Subunit: 505 residues, 4 copies
């Protein structure tokens, strides 16, 4: 007999596990428990802080919710108007000395005319081919070139996506991008070129909300806090080390054994296989591909420079900087960095020089959060990546050589991106059914490994829907039909359903 | 205060209402009640019997189930292996003196060669147009021609569907048919013509099961029987005459008042609007179109003729019979008609003449079930329709002139088919949301009026999902996404879900 | 017996008839003569002069030669270097206050940006349609819109060609435009828009030569002068009034009869049918369609204005002037108008006012020649068209209100353009073979009625090839295959062939 | 000073040179002379006879005339009705034990059904590709596949043409095949298959005429006889050995020198280059490709076998025989072989056996003429080719093993076919203008090397047109525009033109 027995056990308290727990807590039927090896819940949706007081998410984290259930839980966790800040979705592509508004193709009027001619010629070729196309694209690369044509593909989406995924676009599938036909909007593109016009895909209606305090990590701490504490076990005491699927028993770090009837696992599925000591599953999960994420943070003295302005996140297709994305993290909340009256010495200038004085001086401060990818096809020198990132900030004119840096941050995250390779689905449809046969619901960004449902809201709902399937026979729609859930606002499931309404009466 | 109060009231005990009842009963949370004006549950999925002992469904009723939940409930209701007979899905098209195996286009090698040339020429045109098509078909007719070409369209799907729907194909939408591209399989059609080959779309894996006893109506009687009798009200005592949606109060014909929190209404939505005395809903539901079905039954003396054989249902595009479909109902079950030893006089010969002898004689017997449609665009002489059907049977060689008819049946069902007109959706998205804002779930064949989810399993699940939405916040997938539910095996929802297992412990 | 007998009689001494005569004269075998009702040869390629000394052609006449034979005869007729002036082929379209270089679609960068978007959008549609086109256009209008797209078609070729042809573009065929596929060069057009480029289709290699003296009419006076005079009969003495095809006899105005074996007739074929008293042919030729040409000439005081510059001919699609084409006739030769020291009073100002002063002032002078079409579908008010033309010159900014007009000219030419209507070919194939079977070679701009071979070189060669067919069994390539002769350099036939070289020894 | 001087010298008295001579004789202007190394005119259009009395053309020679001038000369040469025999153009393709009527694709109903399926599927692919094609085929092979589809291409045109040209279809151009779009008549092919029909492209309208006597060579002996004998020089006395283009002098084998002003040369242009001792021209003409032709004749005892019937020529794609084409030469004229009373011994049986008796026995007789190609890519064993051909006759069921052979014939012709290789035009457009610059018209099947105008009528007219250019400035249409002359009835040029009519009056 185990030390503890529950109907449903949940491993992990990132957004996916917390979803499972929130739904179980709402249903309040079967018994349950959630564990995590970190005392702080949140997973990759967590937030670090430097000794100088600059917060950093795990790279750019911007919420767009497809589900009212997700909204209900965030509202419950952070219910006050000044728990949040609202911003427009402002993004740009760095190209040939210019900040080009996203989407790139609608804004190539900013490039030299001779280059515009090449882009348009290429997209004309694609428009004519699309008019007679009778096959689907088979790779990410084919999808890109059929949407954009050669010239525009080569300027942004091809080199950018290699810097992100750390594998060539010819090695990835394209089903994950959804059901839309790969074909250009030639009229929209030539119209903006003719008018010499620029236009972003944002406005008063295209917004996101970010937490006032604690970074993205503030959300999940708050969400976790709504659960009954005694059904949680976070920290070293909550670290899973063994999973015996045949006896339906988990063993924790300190030796505690937990019996379950159903298991929701949200740790990386390659880690789960190892914990199960299942050679077959180990082999299979080693054939999944993923990239690692280096997060670099830079804290800068001074008020926000005009050239940065209201920018939120930024794309970097070119080879003069190692990062694929930059976020102006100080624009997300004034509490993501110290207040203007806090005093910090300058650590270095952006060109690498020593400051004239080592004395602590006042702010205000602004802040840049950078992402660099790593894989077996794309090594990252961990001892120089910070300095390379800062040199990249100068090359891209985000920072002047004279800008004063008062804080630095670097951390590597082993499982960063689950890669939509050509082989992914072939491998996943061997792994997930075997786990399912053992009453194990392996779910989440690395729990079920599908990037197209890999954001916070997807993850949270993968947990929720996993519980709903276990208990109420719900379809796991987010897991099996990404296009379905991403193409609609999912409104039916709420934090208060009829069941709880009728029971209370 | 009303005579009765329940959380969920279900109106109608056809398959939809029974689905709602079955799921409410399983969940065993909210209080509930189901009413029907008829003492016998089943609705359009019921069965009549003639005074001579011949059973007739409301036209050809063949079950193909898309859902594990539906299967669970039929199995619980009729658990014994001898409660069912299994048959292959054998159908033919009657055309120019021949029985042509369905699908029609794969079997035109049976037609005269000059006619095959015309067919293939038409399908070649359609193939070539499909190759460069970039628009979706907008009408049922357009869809048919794109799929078949003119020649084949004119032989079967065009005149057949007029006889079914009682409106021109040019007046119907085609979205209801699914997401498949409207284009011919030219190679498969020409291959069978070249090989001189015929092939039906059936075999040992393409089967259906039919109840041993009581016809299709036997299923819904037995399903209803598993419900707690005190929560049912079937007969004159259960006829709904008035719905007060603002008071959430229903009044029955005997004066009984029932108050509700949520209403699942499965009566025809035009009848619901009338009962609500809601003039705006009345005006809207009169914009919907439907056809009536005439069901004609013919009982015949003799063992099953060789020319008929194992045929199950049959399609009639041509003008020499008024019916669009025939069913060899005596093939579906031995107990659909009297035993051989039963003595019955001959009523008439199939050519209309009086029999030589008026004496009761023995069998065996077989049985034909016919459907004739009617609408404002296609009137039907009710006084001659029986004699016309029987002459139709002689014209199509189903009956010899000398065949002895021992039983006849005719019944008109006013709401027979909800028509997929071009206007259907524009109307329904005014009706269904307006009802739902009043907490009324109007569902089913005429509850929500969508033929493409209009069979017995669909109807049952519309009831189930409505309840699942009311209680567990489930997506009503069958209602809003026909293509989704019809395109997969729906296995997640069962008659015993985790909820009931964990609670029983 | 007739007064005169020849082997080959030629009617008409415009370029077609003169071509016949030159080749007959070179071959020097069969006897021949040529007649014309005009004392001066040249037909529609003649030149008028006003009492004030301004020359006008019959509208703008620019030579482009497809044949060495034509070149040899012009060189012979006018052998000196100063018999000719050479110019680049410079033309513009007047549109929205601008002189847009021809071809229009490569120069729309001059229009407002919003016009450019409409133009490119329309051409994108036409490009995408051309990609799947598998039928030839059936009308001139279809050809235009398939070539240019709606927006560009509407700005120039559609309204311009109505003003030229005096019939809707929808009523004309398009085979006459040659064999090139009706499809846009989208890339060339967008490239010039993107780059802000204009470029005319002329330069040092695209030139024409114009006679130094006597206008275009000087060429045919001089060609006719190389013929033996006694074989010509020009003037009232040479006016044909009767053709008796059965007797092979022609009757002249003065009673002279001419017997012939073969007749080359270059008068308008409808006039030929009348002269023949052949009611059947008159009936057929009345089914052909043609437009009349009003030529308006305007002599202006002043040195050539900068705004005019080196322009040669100009197109006018807009409805702010009656004329379809303007020619800067003073640019073609300094002897097309009087020398600077010639004294002329101002007749009127361009604004329409007439000055009191009769003072004769000096020059220099320049000159504008205008063309307006007329047909039974497009009446022209003869009494006001001069004044309307002049106001048109002011609206298009060719003349200033205050410019001084010292000479005016207006003449209406009944047969101006042979129209390539939809019916033309059908009618010609009933006419031309019938004349052929009577040994009548009816040829020329209205002799055989085909505009695509209706220029001076074409006309000359229809004469030449007609004689070559009669004598040497030559293929009449220009008559039956306009695409053949227009698509190559015709160099084989010369004014001195081998026959004449070998004979000389 | 040369031994003889003429204005126009003609080398060669095959059909081309005889064309030039006939036109010079008609014109009767410039002095001329024609020479040949052979005493008998005809070239490759000559005829041999075996010592047993069987005639053989140089392979299958069937006249289809595109020109009235050609007909005039043939009529003049053989004016009597019984100088000619008329036959329908009956041809078949030998394939898989069947005689399949030409054209192959319209008669694949004779193949096994399973093969008809593969054939039709292939053509369905080709039809669908044709609907969206926007390129012209660039090789003979691409042309074949676009016309026929893979399956039909593989059965006939691909293997047959390798057997004809002795080069692969991927190495030849396709322009020579004309302007028709490379695309299938899918409806024509599927129609005959569905109907089970065979039909050839012949009937009462599709005929050819063949000389009663002397074979095809009889035509050219008779044409040559119409020339003034003294302007001819045929035999060893007429053999050209040197051409001195700079001096315009030809030297003959007997030492005779002839001066000329223009040279029409109809010998193979590679031999011409040698005779000119021009090394640049020798190099260039060595880059032309050509195949040799082996002609095999077999005389057979017996009346015409039923299985042979009215067959004229036959195509052999398959690998069980070395010949690509057979001709039933005995069907063309009864004088192509001895009369029935002529007595001959049997040389061998068709399987190679000795006859039972060596006695001369009577006929009747029939006769087979075979063609086998040779090149550097396809050697021919001259010592075994007769026997291989005879075995091929048995393999193809043209001869029974018991059939008695009474005469055999074999002869190799070095220049047989001029090959339309990919390189042909690039070479010829370097050779022909250089010869032209020296007043040398090189013309004919190997004079100008173009197969698409390489028939008797083409060749004859190449010579006619060359003279017409030399004397009258005619366009050499047949040389430069094969599609033009082959696509029309060329009726204008006659043996009696107007020039000769007018001179005689």
């Amino acid at each position: 007999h185990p030390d503890i027995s529950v109907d449903v056990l949940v491993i992990g308290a990132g957004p996916t596990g917390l979803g499972a727990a929130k739904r179980l807590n709402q249903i309040d039927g079967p018994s349950w428990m959630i564990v995590d090896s970190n005392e702080t819940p949140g997973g990759l949706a967590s937030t670090d802080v430097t000794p100088e007081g600059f917060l950093y998410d795990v790279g750019g984290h911007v919420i767009f919710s497809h589900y009212k259930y997700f909204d209900d839980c965030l509202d419950e966790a952070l219910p006050k108007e000044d728990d949040w800040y609202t911003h427009q979705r402002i993004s740009y592509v760095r190209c040939q000395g210019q900040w080009v508004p996203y989407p790139f193709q609608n804004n190539i009027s900013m490039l030299p005319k001779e280059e515009q001619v090449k882009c348009i010629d290429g997209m004309i070729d694609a428009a004519l081919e699309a008019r007679v196309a009778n096959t689907k694209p088979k790779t990410f690369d084919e999808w890109i070139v059929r949407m954009m044509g050669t010239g525009i593909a080569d300027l942004f989406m091809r080199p950018y996506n290699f810097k992100v995924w750390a594998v060539p676009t010819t090695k990835m599938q394209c089903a994950w991008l959804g059901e839309r036909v790969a074909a250009p909007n030639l009229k929209a593109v030539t119209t903006n070129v003719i008018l010499g016009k620029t236009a972003g895909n944002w406005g008063p209606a295209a917004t996101f909300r970010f937490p006032a305090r604690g970074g993205t990590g503030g959300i999940w701490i708050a969400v976790a806090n709504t659960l009954p504490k005694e059904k949680t076990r976070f920290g070293e005491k909550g670290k899973v080390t063994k999973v015996n699927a045949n006896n339906k028993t988990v063993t924790l770090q300190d030796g505690t054994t937990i019996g379950y009837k159903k298991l929701v696992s949200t740790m990386a599925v390659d880690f789960l296989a190892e914990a199960m000591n299942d050679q077959e599953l180990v082999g299979l999960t080693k054939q999944l591909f993923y990239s690692s994420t280096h997060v670099i943070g830079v804290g800068v003295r001074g008020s926000r420079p005009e050239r940065i302005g209201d920018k939120c996140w930024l794309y970097f297709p070119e080879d003069n900087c190692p990062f694929y994305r930059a976020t102006i993290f100080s624009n997300y909340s004034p509490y993501n960095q110290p207040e203007a009256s806090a005093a910090l010495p300058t650590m270095q200038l952006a060109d690498g020089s020593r400051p004239q004085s080592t004395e602590a001086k006042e702010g205000p401060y602004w802040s840049i959060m950078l992402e660099v990818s790593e894989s077996s096809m794309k090594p990252v020198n961990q001892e120089t990546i910070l300095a390379d990132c800062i040199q990249g900030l100068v090359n891209t004119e985000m920072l002047k050589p004279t800008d004063e840096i008062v804080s630095t941050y670097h951390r590597r995250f082993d499982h960063g991106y689950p890669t939509p390779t050509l082989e992914r689905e072939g491998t996943l449809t061997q792994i997930l059914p075997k786990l399912q046969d053992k009453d194990i619901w392996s779910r989440g960004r690395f729990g079920s490994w599908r990037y197209e449902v890999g954001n916070q809201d997807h993850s949270f709902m993968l947990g929720v829907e996993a519980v709903d399937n276990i208990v109420n026979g719900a379809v796991e729609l987010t897991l099996n039909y990404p296009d379905f859930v991403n193409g609609r606002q999912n409104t039916e499931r709420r934090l208060v359903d009829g069941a709880q309404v009728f029971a209370k009466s």
